[PDB]
Structure 1
């Protein structure tokens, strides 16, 4: 038997989050050996039943799609007996924890009429999105994602260093001190230039003056998605603040 775990991204956050958590709950106890692959890794299981126990564990912690197949080996004629060799192909949802995602138009209208230009927040059993301009969350169960897949707009490797000038909070707060209008300037343009950007962001309370934050920088990026092309350009912000550094 074999559970084959796969994730298509070059940098796999949830997949490495899986290996740290597979050791905490003491899950892989019934392995024979562990092989690895280009896209993920493989687990070899002696009996049939120990493989299904892992998939019930994987369903709780990471959004997967799985299916099964088999191979015949012996076909003994003296009794009806199997000697079958099973294979479970498991694939993680290919969006990482903190990417930039542009949703499809019909899908974004059903999840509470969120805007299409959202982040990812909390990546869980289910996939959770966040609108960084106005705080509003929307969940995405894996059965809705695999009936119509889509790709991340930008990875973690596109983050750009920013330097914050001050924080102007609007006093709205769901759970993260919503909509602090951060006046932010580029790390690379602070030295010799006078160029200042102006953006609402969910990083409300944790940010002060002179702090280094990372962010997606839309103003120079030529994306080639048809979803991003089917937008209204003058409603797209220049800066999406992602995370505070250090």
Structure 2
């Protein structure tokens, strides 16, 4: 029996988490061998129902789709190409079916259903694996597409979710503050952790040059110039 998992993403973050969760849930205690693959990993077993157990362990945590090949019980799985700190975007029929979230979204955390979050207003949209792999996309970005910011002041606008504030902040670039004073009017959602001198990493939209098929529907006067993501150390 051979149960194999796959990623199509320029990097790996959900699997750098999977390695952590396997070591605390302990389902590899019976695997004959664990082989790194072109993008993921394969687990070897000698029985069938324990392979049925490992595929259900795989199903237990992350949204997936799972099928069965043969030669010896080959069970393949493809994984959602969505990571914690991504510029993700929901297609038209998917955002009406799921959540009525605006065209721009963020996936703050990963769970059994992939959750989405819009930078402008505060709402969570949980999504099962079926409809996504019925309508596959690749997100517009990953976690390796970031740059650093430097604030002067913070100003929480007072309303707040359990973990969000929709705070308006005045962000300022590091090397630019010293040539120009480019400070924008951008609303932030995680603005409850930022302080009078610390650094946040953010997705610069106002110069980035992307490629995908979902940009031909929206308008160009509603795009935020900047959209931020979680903190590193401060």
Give distance in 1, aligned partners of 2:164 and 2:129.
Answer: 29
The alpha-carbon deviation at position 231 of structure 1 amounts to: 1.4
Match of residue 214, structure 1, among 201, 215, 224: 201
Give distance in 1, aligned partners of 2:80 and 2:211.
Answer: 21
The alpha-carbon deviation at position 182 of structure 1 amounts to: 0.9
The alpha-carbon deviation at position 188 of structure 1 amounts to: 2.7
Query: What residue ranges of structure 2 are gaps of 5+ in the alignment?
Result: none
Moved beyond 6 Å, runs of 4+: none
Against the structure 1 CA distance between its residues 229 and 185, is the aligned structure 2 distance closer, same or farther, given a 3 Å change threshold?
farther
Give distance in 1, aligned partners of 2:187 and 2:216.
Answer: 23
The alpha-carbon deviation at position 10 of structure 1 amounts to: 2.5
- TM-score when scaled to structure 2? 0.96
Give distance in 2, aligned partners of 1:142 and 1:194.
Answer: 45
8 A Cα contact 1:176 1:204, kept in partner:
no
The alpha-carbon deviation at position 177 of structure 1 amounts to: 4.0
Residues 115-157 of structure 1: CA distance to partner in whole angstroms, max 9, x if unpaired?
0111111111110001122111101100111111011101111
8 A Cα contact 1:5 1:89, kept in partner:
yes
- TM-score when scaled to structure 1? 0.91
Give distance in 2, aligned partners of 1:21 and 1:208.
Answer: 32
Give distance in 2, aligned partners of 1:200 and 1:114.
Answer: 17
Residues 14-71 of structure 1: CA distance to partner in whole angstroms, max 9, x if unpaired?
1121111111111111111111111111111111121111111111111111100212
8 A Cα contact 1:14 1:62, kept in partner:
no
Structure 1 residues 187-196 or 51-60, which shifts more? 187-196
The alpha-carbon deviation at position 8 of structure 1 amounts to: 0.9
The alpha-carbon deviation at position 111 of structure 1 amounts to: 2.2
Give distance in 2, aligned partners of 1:26 and 1:102.
Answer: 34
8 A Cα contact 1:62 1:125, kept in partner:
yes
Give distance in 1, aligned partners of 2:232 and 2:175.
Answer: 16
Aligned to 2:230: 243
Query: What residue ranges of structure 1 are gaps of 5+ in the alignment?
Result: 72-84
Specify the SS of the correspondent of 2:214: helix
8 A Cα contact 1:5 1:42, kept in partner:
yes
Against the structure 1 CA distance between its residues 177 and 119, is the aligned structure 2 distance closer, same or farther, given a 3 Å change threshold?
closer
Structure 1 residues 33-42 or 210-219, which shifts more? 33-42
Aligned length: 233
Give distance in 2, aligned partners of 1:48 and 1:177.
Answer: 46
Across the aligned residues of Structure 1 and Structure 2, the Cα RMSD in angstroms comes to: 1.2
Aligned to 2:137: 150
Give distance in 2, aligned partners of 1:40 and 1:10.
Answer: 12
Give distance in 2, aligned partners of 1:118 and 1:229.
Answer: 17
Structure 1 residues 188-197 or 211-220, which shifts more? 188-197
